[PDB]
Paper text:
A major factor that limits the expansion of shrimp cultures is, however, infectious diseases from viruses, such as P. vannamei nodavirus (PvNV) and [name] nodavirus (MrNV), which have inflicted heavy economic losses. In this work, we have determined the cryo-EM structures of T = 3 and T = 1 PvNV-LPs at atomic resolution, the crystal structures of the P-domains of PvNV and MrNV (PvNVPd and MrNVPd), and the crystal structure of the S-domain of PvNV (ΔN-ARM-PvNVSd) in the T = 1 subviral particle (SVP).
The overall conformations and dimer interfaces in three crystal structures of MrNVPd are similar with a RMSD < 0.3 Å. Second, the structure of MrNVPd (P4332) reveals an additional metal-binding site involved coordinating with both oxygen atoms from the side-chain carboxyl groups of two Glu300 residues. The distances for the Cd2+-ligand oxygens from the two Glu300 residues are ~2.4 Å. Finally, the initial difference map shows one outstanding electron density peak near residues Cys309 and Thr343, which is interpreted as one Cd2+ ion. This Cd2+ ion is coordinated to the sulfur atoms from the side chain of Cys309 residue, one sulfate molecule from the crystallization buffer, and a backbone carbonyl oxygen atom from the main chain carboxyl groups from residues Thr343.
Residue numbers in the entry:
A (entry chain B): 4 to 126
B (entry chain A): 9 to 126
Write the structure that this text describes.
Amino acid sequence: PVEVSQLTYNADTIGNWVPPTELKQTYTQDITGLKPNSKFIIVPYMDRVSSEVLQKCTITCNEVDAVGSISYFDTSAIKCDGYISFQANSIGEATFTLVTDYQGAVDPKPYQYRIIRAIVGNN
Amino acid sequence: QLTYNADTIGNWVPPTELKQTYTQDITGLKPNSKFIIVPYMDRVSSEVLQKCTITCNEVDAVGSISYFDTSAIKCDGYISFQANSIGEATFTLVTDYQGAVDPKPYQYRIIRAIVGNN
Protein backbone atom coordinates (compact mmCIF):
# COMPACT_ATOMS: atom_id res chain seq x y z
CA PRO A 1 0.00 0.00 0.00
CA VAL A 2 1.17 3.44 -1.07
CA GLU A 3 1.41 6.11 1.63
CA VAL A 4 -0.49 9.36 1.08
CA SER A 5 2.84 11.25 1.10
CA GLN A 6 3.75 9.21 -2.06
CA LEU A 7 0.30 9.71 -3.79
CA THR A 8 0.53 10.20 -7.58
CA TYR A 9 -2.18 10.43 -10.26
CA ASN A 10 -1.99 8.28 -13.34
CA ALA A 11 -3.74 10.11 -16.18
CA ASP A 12 -2.14 8.53 -19.26
CA THR A 13 -5.02 6.09 -20.11
CA ILE A 14 -6.96 7.55 -23.01
CA GLY A 15 -9.57 6.11 -25.37
CA ASN A 16 -12.36 6.76 -27.86
CA TRP A 17 -16.10 6.51 -27.58
CA VAL A 18 -17.47 4.44 -30.46
CA PRO A 19 -19.30 6.82 -32.77
CA PRO A 20 -22.98 6.40 -33.50
CA THR A 21 -24.28 5.08 -36.85
CA GLU A 22 -27.63 6.90 -36.65
CA LEU A 23 -28.39 10.65 -36.22
CA LYS A 24 -30.14 9.94 -32.88
CA GLN A 25 -28.87 6.99 -30.91
CA THR A 26 -28.61 5.62 -27.37
CA TYR A 27 -26.12 2.86 -26.69
CA THR A 28 -23.58 1.53 -24.20
CA GLN A 29 -19.85 1.07 -24.09
CA ASP A 30 -17.70 -1.01 -21.74
CA ILE A 31 -14.28 0.04 -20.59
CA THR A 32 -12.14 -2.94 -19.60
CA GLY A 33 -8.67 -3.78 -18.19
CA LEU A 34 -8.95 -1.48 -15.17
CA LYS A 35 -7.63 -2.41 -11.70
CA PRO A 36 -10.45 -4.35 -10.06
CA ASN A 37 -12.49 -2.49 -7.48
CA SER A 38 -10.37 0.71 -7.85
CA LYS A 39 -11.88 4.20 -7.85
CA PHE A 40 -11.37 6.30 -10.96
CA ILE A 41 -12.59 9.49 -12.56
CA ILE A 42 -13.15 9.76 -16.30
CA VAL A 43 -12.91 13.16 -17.91
CA PRO A 44 -13.43 14.32 -21.50
CA TYR A 45 -10.53 15.77 -23.55
CA MET A 46 -10.42 16.92 -27.13
CA ASP A 47 -7.96 16.75 -29.98
CA ARG A 48 -10.36 16.69 -32.84
CA VAL A 49 -11.31 18.54 -35.93
CA SER A 50 -14.90 19.87 -35.57
CA SER A 51 -17.49 18.27 -37.85
CA GLU A 52 -19.45 21.57 -37.82
CA VAL A 53 -22.67 19.49 -37.95
CA LEU A 54 -23.67 19.73 -34.32
CA GLN A 55 -22.47 16.41 -32.97
CA LYS A 56 -23.82 16.27 -29.44
CA CYS A 57 -22.87 13.33 -27.09
CA THR A 58 -23.76 12.90 -23.40
CA ILE A 59 -22.27 10.08 -21.27
CA THR A 60 -23.43 8.84 -17.92
CA CYS A 61 -23.32 5.67 -15.71
CA ASN A 62 -26.70 4.61 -14.38
CA GLU A 63 -25.24 3.17 -11.11
CA VAL A 64 -26.34 5.39 -8.19
CA ASP A 65 -22.98 6.36 -6.79
CA ALA A 66 -21.30 6.60 -10.19
CA VAL A 67 -21.63 10.38 -10.16
CA GLY A 68 -21.50 12.91 -13.05
CA SER A 69 -22.24 13.33 -16.72
CA ILE A 70 -19.82 14.11 -19.56
CA SER A 71 -20.86 16.41 -22.43
CA TYR A 72 -19.28 16.84 -25.86
CA PHE A 73 -20.27 19.32 -28.56
CA ASP A 74 -18.07 20.39 -31.45
CA THR A 75 -19.87 23.27 -33.26
CA SER A 76 -19.29 26.83 -32.21
CA ALA A 77 -20.46 26.51 -28.60
CA ILE A 78 -17.75 23.97 -27.73
CA LYS A 79 -18.40 21.58 -24.92
CA CYS A 80 -15.82 19.19 -23.45
CA ASP A 81 -17.15 19.16 -19.87
CA GLY A 82 -18.22 17.14 -16.89
CA TYR A 83 -16.78 13.98 -15.48
CA ILE A 84 -17.87 10.59 -14.07
CA SER A 85 -16.49 9.30 -10.79
CA PHE A 86 -16.90 5.52 -10.63
CA GLN A 87 -15.55 2.27 -9.18
CA ALA A 88 -14.46 -0.49 -11.54
CA ASN A 89 -16.18 -3.81 -10.81
CA SER A 90 -14.58 -7.01 -9.50
CA ILE A 91 -13.26 -7.92 -12.96
CA GLY A 92 -11.88 -4.43 -13.89
CA GLU A 93 -14.81 -3.19 -15.99
CA ALA A 94 -17.26 -0.40 -16.19
CA THR A 95 -20.16 0.44 -18.49
CA PHE A 96 -21.41 3.85 -19.74
CA THR A 97 -24.52 5.03 -21.41
CA LEU A 98 -24.20 7.28 -24.47
CA VAL A 99 -26.94 9.47 -25.87
CA THR A 100 -26.07 11.13 -29.22
CA ASP A 101 -27.90 13.72 -31.31
CA TYR A 102 -25.87 14.52 -34.44
CA GLN A 103 -27.26 16.69 -37.28
CA GLY A 104 -24.96 14.84 -39.62
CA ALA A 105 -23.23 11.52 -39.16
CA VAL A 106 -21.58 10.17 -42.30
CA ASP A 107 -18.29 8.96 -40.75
CA PRO A 108 -17.98 10.84 -37.43
CA LYS A 109 -14.72 11.18 -35.55
CA PRO A 110 -14.88 9.69 -32.04
CA TYR A 111 -15.06 11.77 -28.93
CA GLN A 112 -12.25 11.14 -26.53
CA TYR A 113 -11.74 10.35 -22.87
CA ARG A 114 -9.00 10.24 -20.28
CA ILE A 115 -9.11 7.99 -17.15
CA ILE A 116 -7.47 9.24 -14.00
CA ARG A 117 -6.45 6.99 -11.09
CA ALA A 118 -5.02 8.13 -7.76
CA ILE A 119 -2.26 5.65 -6.85
CA VAL A 120 -2.52 5.56 -3.06
CA GLY A 121 -3.46 2.81 -0.56
CA ASN A 122 -4.36 -0.23 -2.58
CA ASN A 123 -6.28 1.84 -5.24
CA GLN B 1 -12.21 5.96 2.05
CA LEU B 2 -10.92 7.24 -1.39
CA THR B 3 -13.31 9.62 -3.19
CA TYR B 4 -12.51 12.32 -5.78
CA ASN B 5 -13.61 15.90 -5.62
CA ALA B 6 -13.76 17.34 -9.20
CA ASP B 7 -16.11 20.29 -8.77
CA THR B 8 -13.46 23.01 -8.33
CA ILE B 9 -13.48 24.95 -11.62
CA GLY B 10 -11.90 28.20 -12.67
CA ASN B 11 -10.71 30.49 -15.39
CA TRP B 12 -7.30 31.25 -16.78
CA VAL B 13 -6.79 35.02 -16.94
CA PRO B 14 -6.86 35.97 -20.65
CA PRO B 15 -3.90 37.69 -22.30
CA THR B 16 -3.83 41.39 -23.02
CA GLU B 17 -1.43 41.03 -25.99
CA LEU B 18 -1.44 38.83 -29.07
CA LYS B 19 1.64 36.94 -27.98
CA GLN B 20 2.23 36.70 -24.25
CA THR B 21 3.92 34.78 -21.47
CA TYR B 22 2.58 35.36 -17.96
CA THR B 23 1.90 33.62 -14.71
CA GLN B 24 -1.19 32.88 -12.70
CA ASP B 25 -1.51 31.66 -9.11
CA ILE B 26 -4.32 29.28 -8.22
CA THR B 27 -5.13 29.85 -4.55
CA GLY B 28 -7.40 28.43 -1.89
CA LEU B 29 -6.13 24.85 -2.24
CA LYS B 30 -5.46 22.55 0.72
CA PRO B 31 -1.92 23.29 1.82
CA ASN B 32 0.63 20.66 0.67
CA SER B 33 -2.01 18.49 -0.95
CA LYS B 34 -1.59 16.69 -4.35
CA PHE B 35 -3.85 17.51 -7.23
CA ILE B 36 -4.28 17.03 -10.95
CA ILE B 37 -5.60 19.89 -13.01
CA VAL B 38 -7.27 19.15 -16.37
CA PRO B 39 -8.63 21.44 -19.11
CA TYR B 40 -12.28 21.61 -19.89
CA MET B 41 -14.40 23.64 -22.28
CA ASP B 42 -17.75 25.28 -22.14
CA ARG B 43 -17.02 28.14 -24.39
CA VAL B 44 -17.99 29.81 -27.71
CA SER B 45 -15.03 29.62 -30.09
CA SER B 46 -13.50 33.01 -30.96
CA GLU B 47 -12.57 31.59 -34.38
CA VAL B 48 -9.44 33.67 -34.17
CA LEU B 49 -6.97 30.90 -33.35
CA GLN B 50 -6.48 31.45 -29.64
CA LYS B 51 -3.76 29.14 -28.62
CA CYS B 52 -2.81 28.63 -24.98
CA THR B 53 -0.23 26.35 -23.41
CA ILE B 54 0.23 25.88 -19.57
CA THR B 55 2.96 24.40 -17.43
CA CYS B 56 3.42 24.49 -13.61
CA ASN B 57 6.21 26.27 -11.86
CA GLU B 58 5.95 24.17 -8.64
CA VAL B 59 8.85 21.78 -7.75
CA ASP B 60 8.26 18.19 -9.14
CA ALA B 61 5.06 19.13 -11.08
CA VAL B 62 4.55 17.17 -14.27
CA GLY B 63 2.61 17.67 -17.57
CA SER B 64 1.42 20.36 -19.88
CA ILE B 65 -2.12 21.61 -20.86
CA SER B 66 -3.10 22.85 -24.33
CA TYR B 67 -6.08 24.82 -25.56
CA PHE B 68 -7.10 25.79 -29.11
CA ASP B 69 -10.53 26.88 -30.20
CA THR B 70 -10.60 27.13 -34.05
CA SER B 71 -11.44 24.15 -36.24
CA ALA B 72 -8.85 21.77 -34.85
CA ILE B 73 -10.17 21.84 -31.25
CA LYS B 74 -7.65 21.21 -28.50
CA CYS B 75 -8.59 20.69 -24.86
CA ASP B 76 -5.86 18.39 -23.87
CA GLY B 77 -3.19 17.40 -21.37
CA TYR B 78 -2.98 17.60 -17.61
CA ILE B 79 -0.69 18.80 -14.79
CA SER B 80 -0.10 16.80 -11.65
CA PHE B 81 1.20 19.02 -8.85
CA GLN B 82 1.47 19.68 -5.17
CA ALA B 83 0.07 22.84 -3.62
CA ASN B 84 2.63 24.89 -1.57
CA SER B 85 2.35 25.51 2.27
CA ILE B 86 0.11 28.45 1.59
CA GLY B 87 -2.39 26.56 -0.50
CA GLU B 88 -1.15 28.03 -3.87
CA ALA B 89 0.39 26.85 -7.09
CA THR B 90 1.98 28.93 -9.83
CA PHE B 91 1.43 28.31 -13.56
CA THR B 92 3.12 29.71 -16.65
CA LEU B 93 0.82 30.55 -19.54
CA VAL B 94 2.15 30.95 -23.16
CA THR B 95 -0.47 32.41 -25.49
CA ASP B 96 -0.45 33.09 -29.25
CA TYR B 97 -3.77 34.49 -30.36
CA GLN B 98 -4.48 35.81 -33.92
CA GLY B 99 -6.97 38.14 -32.40
CA ALA B 100 -7.55 39.33 -28.87
CA VAL B 101 -10.40 41.78 -28.29
CA ASP B 102 -11.85 40.93 -24.86
CA PRO B 103 -11.03 37.13 -25.15
CA LYS B 104 -13.08 34.52 -23.28
CA PRO B 105 -11.02 32.69 -20.70
CA TYR B 106 -9.98 29.14 -21.04
CA GLN B 107 -11.23 26.90 -18.25
CA TYR B 108 -9.78 24.39 -15.84
CA ARG B 109 -11.00 21.74 -13.46
CA ILE B 110 -9.00 20.66 -10.37
CA ILE B 111 -9.25 17.08 -9.16
CA ARG B 112 -8.28 16.09 -5.63
CA ALA B 113 -8.16 12.59 -4.18
CA ILE B 114 -9.88 12.84 -0.77
CA VAL B 115 -7.93 10.27 1.12
CA GLY B 116 -6.06 10.50 4.42
CA ASN B 117 -4.93 14.02 4.98
CA ASN B 118 -4.85 14.83 1.21
